[PDB]
Design an enzyme around this catalytic site. Structure first.
Site, PDB file in Angstrom:
ATOM      1  N   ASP B  48      11.224  33.934  -1.369  1.00  0.00           N
ATOM      2  CA  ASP B  48      12.496  34.169  -0.260  1.00  0.00           C
ATOM      3  C   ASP B  48      13.093  32.843  -0.506  1.00  0.00           C
ATOM      4  O   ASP B  48      12.396  31.404   0.378  1.00  0.00           O
ATOM      5  CB  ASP B  48      11.543  34.101   0.874  1.00  0.00           C
ATOM      6  CG  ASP B  48      13.116  33.924   1.735  1.00  0.00           C
ATOM      7  OD1 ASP B  48      13.326  34.562   1.867  1.00  0.00           O
ATOM      8  OD2 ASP B  48      12.760  32.535   2.781  1.00  0.00           O
ATOM      9  N   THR B  81      19.005  34.920   3.142  1.00  0.00           N
ATOM     10  CA  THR B  81      19.360  33.689   3.294  1.00  0.00           C
ATOM     11  C   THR B  81      19.064  33.382   1.357  1.00  0.00           C
ATOM     12  O   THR B  81      18.730  32.267   1.184  1.00  0.00           O
ATOM     13  CB  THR B  81      18.049  32.786   3.941  1.00  0.00           C
ATOM     14  OG1 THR B  81      16.613  33.565   3.523  1.00  0.00           O
ATOM     15  CG2 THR B  81      17.904  33.835   5.507  1.00  0.00           C
ATOM     16  N   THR B  82      18.561  34.208   0.805  1.00  0.00           N
ATOM     17  CA  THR B  82      18.524  34.314  -0.786  1.00  0.00           C
ATOM     18  C   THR B  82      19.916  34.692  -1.028  1.00  0.00           C
ATOM     19  O   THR B  82      20.282  34.288  -2.182  1.00  0.00           O
ATOM     20  CB  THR B  82      17.573  35.157  -1.157  1.00  0.00           C
ATOM     21  OG1 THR B  82      16.160  35.314  -0.620  1.00  0.00           O
ATOM     22  CG2 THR B  82      17.223  35.428  -2.865  1.00  0.00           C
ATOM     23  N   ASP B 382      11.411  39.176  11.717  1.00  0.00           N
ATOM     24  CA  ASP B 382      11.975  39.943  10.965  1.00  0.00           C
ATOM     25  C   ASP B 382      12.870  41.245  11.921  1.00  0.00           C
ATOM     26  O   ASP B 382      13.971  41.829  11.291  1.00  0.00           O
ATOM     27  CB  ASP B 382      11.607  40.625   9.531  1.00  0.00           C
ATOM     28  CG  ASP B 382      11.553  39.030   8.756  1.00  0.00           C
ATOM     29  OD1 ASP B 382      12.251  38.236   8.877  1.00  0.00           O
ATOM     30  OD2 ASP B 382      10.195  39.515   7.494  1.00  0.00           O
TER      31      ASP B 382
END
Lengths: 517, 508
Positions: B48, B81-82, B382
């Site tokens: 991540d 976010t990656t 999440d």
């Protein structure tokens, strides 16, 4: 032993191709900036043509050594367009690195570059309709050779040159199944008079000899005595010994040779062909004696000059004074004399209505420097017309057809959606480099230039409305009259994808120390 | 001349990708764990790569925009976010071509801001509208993304718990973005993932009750922001003490004023009292608190200062600083307040509902030990974010890298049909789009160059009939086997990089 694998190969393939494509893109169009050359003898040469310079530049790389024969095929067939095949194929090449930097394999794009070349040629069949009748289409070629002359060698377009040049080709095309051979025509240039002077010769020309104006300067019937045998005493560049017994023997010798002069007359004149031309020369002493004896003779004729008059007449040459017939004489259509230049001397123009085996446009110059620059404009104008006389296929190139197929091939990357899409994308963006390069060497912004006709493709497809390069602000191709042959542009498609195919041909990039050494 | 800032730009463009190029390996659920060498030197197995950016980074202004880029993706979405890393380095590849071409960065900035507005428009047509008031439609939409992500081992039972949690704060069909500033995550040390649930109002930690009540019905939530002791320079009880009378006369008087302040609490009506730490004050007198708890008030003590500011805005217990702020609006009104000591180890106070603006929703995380508890924390949050990103953006887009290959196919086409000196910029903008699923189609294996051209084989003709499916590990349609995502996690990953790019173009 050093091996430059893959990318390391292609980096060597970049740098020469990057150099040669950048020197061409400063040279497209009449806004093309001229190419300067210092020879290996240290001689200043200034052209704007790539096929000159690629022949003149000492090529030092596998990419560079290719470009001599690649530009040989374009100029011998098409003529103009030496720069555009180099700008395009290098622009695929530098993009192919970016694809190889994207990770796209160099083979799958070289597979797709050929298919990208197919759909572009497919588009040219739709572009710029191919019917131009014989009396009318001289005038756009009168306009096309106006563009080549009126901006490069002479600022204001010799009108007599571009109109004669379209007339020399119909002299040979009709006899040759609507096609011209480039050895049946010749761009003949001899300075000495005026740079405005330009003639069409259906045969060849020789400088007509008269020794005195007090002796009659004749020209007569349309039949030439193409002779190597002596009608006048010849000179094979050597020396006998002279000996006479008495002075009065030499007084009788003048009376003896005068009968021998008439015998050379009465043999030739009874066969026909009263214009006598002999290969080996002589002084002006017995020359004006034969002029007094009422047949003109041309002396000091060049070696191959007797051959070119023979094929232009279609007849043979008389080898010996004892072998005498009319089939070995010239069969001419018109033999009349016109002054060479304006000030020095006269020629003997031997025109034929029989055989167009040497139809020579004859130009003059007031400068030695301008005429080969004038002939180089005339060399390419006589090559593009060979495309039209076979098929009347034309193209409105210069910025219209370049953006048009760049729409199509990029569309064909989406219509034919598979692996070659980036190869078609590398083909399509490289098409945009060309009308950029017509505005890049121009004073205009090329970034603005690619925008305008792109909106015109949203407006209208198959454009006769592309950019200008005369800075008139009128961007057309049919009212700007920038029109070329469709065969020539299609040939440029084949040649540019040939080179990228050519540098892909083995996988060997290893050397023993000697593969470019 | 801008030639000296020109060299600064290409250095900034090169340096921003070089840190971001390690995230190319870490891209996707089949992405690579990246082992971190610390500044003192230690190994840290990490995925991540946003967390990698927070953990180990170099001090470079283009690199310091990267940690800001993912942090905005953390707070707006928390997902993608990656992918928000990979889009920005992809755009910088497009920037290098045009600056070498000789295009002003002001031109490249405004062209990307137009194409950003243009791309999300066509991407919205790719998306399909889903419900936000149907609780069941939200359940199917969330867990398919949750099964698409890495953790689904606890997200199965914890998906509908999050669905019931957000459904209480879904009052309209518009259903705004979501405040996580009423969502409180509460750990219970024992218990089970099966026993994790949603307790309304707020859930408190350890209470401190000297004689106080345990279960009070219709409680009054109170706050204490005043000290009960003497000033302190060296001693809390500043005596020079060597004597029994001087310690007796002054310390009985310390009891005197804290007698009168305690009586003012119960007379105004209080049953639950919020007391912060005694390091957040100087001292808190427990004997007055004993007399306070003898006046039958349940009391918690030693809570954080900013955590009270969470509590004050969630349940409407507006800040009480003195006796004079004992009112009806400063004090919250719970219906039932009690502590649950059983059903797992530890003990946690339950404010079961309160007179609260909106709906104050709190989850109780349980588990065997802290590591098992920390498994559910990623599992709930999440699950909270995929609901949060769908109520922000109504429509749903099937995820899997395919809509980027869809959108780049249109943006190349429209930029040709539009016009432009900046038409190259949008056509280079679209060339940056398919880099990210290609770098995803390395992590799936199954050659990405051969992969990415065959998705817009299906995005051109059937508009999508094949996708990148990490379940298959390659070519399988994300509509055939359902791999979805919210619309926001794609758009927010897209728009933040574009805003980042137009900045560094204009940065000298």
């Amino acid at each position: 032993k050093s091996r430059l694998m893959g990318l390391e190969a292609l980096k060597s393939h970049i740098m020469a191709a990057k150099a040669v494509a950048n020197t061409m893109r400063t040279s497209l169009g009449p806004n093309g900036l001229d190419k300067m050359m210092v020879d290996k003898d240290g001689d200043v040469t200034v052209t704007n043509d790539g096929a000159t310079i690629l022949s003149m530049m000492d090529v030092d790389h596998q990419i560079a050594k290719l470009m001599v024969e690649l530009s040989k095929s374009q100029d011998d067939e098409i003529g103009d367009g030496t720069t555009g095949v180099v700008v395009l194929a290098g622009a695929l090449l530098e993009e192919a690195e970016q694809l190889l930097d994207r990770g796209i394999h160099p083979i799958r794009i070289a597979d797709g570059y050929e298919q990208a070349a197919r759909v572009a040629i497919e588009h040219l069949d739709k572009i710029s309709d191919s019917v131009l009748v014989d009396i009318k289409d001289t005038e756009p070629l009168i306009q096309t050779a106006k563009t080549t002359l009126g901006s490069k060698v002479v600022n204001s377009c010799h009108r007599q040159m571009a109109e004669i040049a379209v007339n020399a080709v119909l002299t040979v095309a009709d006899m040759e199944r609507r096609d011209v051979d480039f050895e049946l025509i010749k761009v003949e240039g001899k300075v000495g008079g005026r740079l405005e002077d330009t003639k069409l010769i259906k045969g060849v020309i020789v400088d007509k000899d008269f020794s005195h104006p007090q002796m009659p300067k004749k020209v007569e019937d349309a039949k030439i005595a193409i002779l190597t045998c002596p009608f006048e005493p010849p000179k094979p560049k050597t020396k006998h010994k002279l000996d006479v017994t008495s002075v009065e023997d030499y007084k009788a010798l003048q009376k003896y040779e005068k009968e021998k002069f008439e015998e050379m007359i009465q043999q030739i004149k009874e066969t026909g062909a009263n214009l006598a031309i002999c290969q080996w020369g002589f002084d002006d002493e017995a020359n004006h004696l034969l002029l007094q004896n009422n047949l003109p003779a041309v002396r000091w004729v060049g070696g191959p000059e007797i051959e070119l008059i023979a094929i232009a007449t279609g007849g043979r040459i008389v080898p010996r004074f004892s072998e005498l017939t009319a089939e070995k004489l010239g069969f001419a259509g018109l033999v009349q004399e016109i002054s060479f230049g304006t000030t020095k001397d006269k020629m003997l123009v031997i025109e034929q209505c029989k055989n167009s085996r040497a139809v020579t446009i004859f130009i003059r110059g007031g400068n030695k420097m301008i005429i080969e620059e004038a002939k180089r404009s005339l060399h390419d104008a006589l090559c593009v017309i060979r495309n039209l006389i076979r098929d009347n296929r034309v193209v409105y190139g210069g910025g219209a057809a370049e953006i048009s197929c760049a729409l199509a091939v990029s569309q064909e990357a989406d219509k034919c959606p598979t692996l070659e899409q980036y190869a078609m994308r590398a083909f399509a963006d490289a098409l945009e480099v060309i009308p950029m390069a017509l505005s890049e060497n121009s004073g205009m912004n090329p970034i603005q230039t690619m925008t305008e006709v792109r909106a015109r493709q949203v407006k209208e497809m198959n454009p006769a409305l592309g950019i200008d390069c005369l800075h008139k602000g009128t961007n057309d191709m049919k009212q700007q009259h920038v029109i070329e042959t469709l065969i020539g542009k299609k040939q440029q498609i084949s040649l540019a994808t040939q080179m990228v195919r050519m540098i892909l041909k083995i996988d060997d990039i290893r050397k023993p120390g000697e593969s470019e050494e | 001349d801008r030639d000296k800032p020109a060299q600064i730009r290409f250095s900034n463009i090169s340096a921003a990708k070089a840190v971001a190029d390690a995230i190319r390996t870490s891209l996707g659920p089949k992405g690579m764990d990246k082992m971190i060498q610390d500044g003192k030197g230690d190994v840290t197995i990490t995925n991540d790569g946003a967390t990698i950016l927070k953990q180990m980074q170099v001090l470079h202004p283009a690199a310091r925009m990267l940690v800001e880029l993912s942090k905005a993706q953390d707070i707006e979405a928390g997902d993608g976010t990656t992918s928000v890393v990979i889009i920005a380095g992809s755009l910088l590849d497009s920037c290098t071509k045009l600056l070498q071409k000789g295009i002003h960065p002001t031109i490249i900035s405004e062209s990307f801001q137009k194409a950003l507005e243009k791309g999300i428009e066509i991407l919205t047509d790719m998306s399909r509208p889903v419900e936000l008031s149907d609780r069941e439609t939200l359940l199917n939409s969330a867990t398919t993304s949750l099964n698409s992500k890495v953790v689904s081992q606890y997200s199965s039972l914890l998906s509908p718990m999050s669905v019931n949690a957000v459904m209480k704060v879904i009052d309209p069909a518009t259903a705004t973005s979501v405040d996580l500033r009423d969502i409180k995550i509460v750990k219970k040390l024992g218990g089970t993932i099966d026993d994790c649930e949603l307790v309304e109002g707020l859930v408190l930690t350890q209470k401190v009750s000297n004689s106080g009540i345990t279960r009070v019905e219709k409680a009054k939530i109170g706050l204490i922001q005043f000290c009960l002791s003497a000033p302190k320079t060296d001693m809390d009880n500043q005596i020079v003490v060597s004597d029994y009378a001087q310690m007796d006369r002054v310390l009985r008087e310390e009891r005197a004023y804290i007698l009168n302040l305690v009586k003012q609490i119960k007379k105004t009506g209080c049953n639950v009292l919020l007391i912060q730490k005694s390091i957040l004050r100087d001292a808190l007198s427990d004997l007055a608190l004993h007399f306070l708890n003898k006046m039958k008030i349940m009391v918690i003590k030693d809570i954080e200062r900013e955590d009270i500011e969470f509590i004050c805005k969630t349940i409407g217990t507006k800040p009480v600083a003195h006796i004079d702020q004992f009112t009806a609006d400063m004090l919250g009104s719970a219906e039932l307040a009690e502590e649950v000591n059983l059903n797992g180890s530890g003990k946690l106070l339950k404010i079961t509902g309160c007179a609260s603006p909106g709906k104050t929703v709190t989850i109780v995380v349980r588990g065997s030990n802290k590591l098992v508890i920390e498994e559910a924390e990623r599992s709930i949050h999440d699950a909270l974010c995929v609901i949060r990103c769908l109520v922000k953006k109504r429509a749903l887009i099937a995820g899997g890298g395919a809509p980027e290959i869809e959108l780049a196919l249109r943006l190349t086409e429209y930029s040709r049909t539009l016009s432009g000196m900046e038409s190259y910029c949008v056509r280079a903008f679209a060339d940056a789009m398919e880099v990210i699923p290609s770098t995803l189609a390395e992590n799936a294996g199954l050659n990405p160059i051969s992969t990415v051209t065959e998705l817009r084989n299906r995005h051109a003709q059937g508009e999508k009939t094949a996708g990148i499916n990490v379940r298959k590990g390659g070519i399988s349609n994300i509509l055939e086997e359902l791999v979805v995502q919210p619309l926001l996690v794609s758009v927010s990953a897209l728009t933040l990089a574009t805003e980042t790019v137009r900045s560094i173009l204009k940065i000298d």
